[PDB]
Design a protein around this ligand. Structure first.
Ligand code: HEM
Length: 153
C-alpha cells in the first residue's frame, strides 16, 4: 500500500482538485474523451459531443466531472480503507456501464496529465509518485472486483 507520508502527499495534491472540482473534473473527462474517443461511446449522454468545443461548453459534462472526482476524492480520503466506497463503483462500472479496466487506466493517466497541466511546476516528483500509487491502488482494487464478476469488457 501507500506509506503515511505518501497518503499525506496524495491528500495534499487533492487540495488542488478541491479548490476547483468542476474544472479539474471537466479537464479530466475531456482529456479522456479526446485521447480515447471510444470512451465517449460508453456515455450515451456525451455521445452527441462531436467536438472538444462542445465538450468544453457542456454543463452536464462539468457536472459529471464533479460527480466523478467527488467519488474519487471520497475514496482517496479513506487512505486505502475504501472497500465500502469502491465495491459499488466497481460493480456499477462493470455490470451497468461496461467499462473495461483499460478505460480506468486511461482516466488515471488523464488525472496525472491534468494535474501537471493545471499546476505546471507545482506537481512535484514525490507528489506524482504518491498520486500514481493511489490511482493504481484504486484501479487494482476495482480490477479485483472485475475478476470476481468475470468482467472484461
Ligand atoms: C476515477 C474513475 C471513475 C470514477 C470515480 C467514476 C465515478 C462514477 C460515478 C460516481 C458515477 C455515478 C454513479 C454510478 O453509476 O456508479 C459514474 C457513472 C458512470 N461512469 Fe464512471 N467513474 C470513473 C471512471 C469511468 C470511466 C473511465 C468511464 C468510461 C470510460 C465511466 C463511465 C461511466 C458511465 C457511462 C456512467 C453513467 C453515466 C450516466 O449516464 O449518468 N466511468 N461514474
Amino acid at each position: 500500500g501507500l506509506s503515511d507520508g505518501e497518503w499525506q502527499q496524495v491528500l495534499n495534491v487533492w487540495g488542488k482538485v478541491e479548490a476547483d472540482i468542476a474544472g479539474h473534473g471537466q479537464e479530466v473527462l475531456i482529456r479522456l474523451f479526446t485521447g480515447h474517443p471510444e470512451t465517449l461511446e460508453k456515455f450515451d449522454k456525451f455521445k452527441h459531443l462531436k467536438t472538444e468545443a462542445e465538450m468544453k461548453a457542456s454543463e452536464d459534462l462539468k457536472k459529471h466531472g464533479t460527480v466523478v472526482l467527488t467519488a474519487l476524492g471520497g475514496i482517496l480520503k479513506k487512505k486505502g480503507h475504501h472497500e465500502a466506497e469502491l465495491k459499488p463503483l466497481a460493480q456499477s462500472h462493470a455490470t451497468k456501464h461496461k467499462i473495461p479496466i483499460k478505460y480506468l487506466e486511461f482516466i488515471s493517466d488523464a488525472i496525472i496529465h491534468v494535474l501537471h497541466s493545471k499546476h505546471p511546476g507545482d506537481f512535484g516528483a514525490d507528489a506524482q509518485g504518491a498520486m500514481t500509487k493511489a490511482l493504481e491502488l484504486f484501479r487494482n482494487d476495482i480490477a479485483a472486483k472485475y475478476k470476481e464478476l468475470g468482467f472484461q469488457g
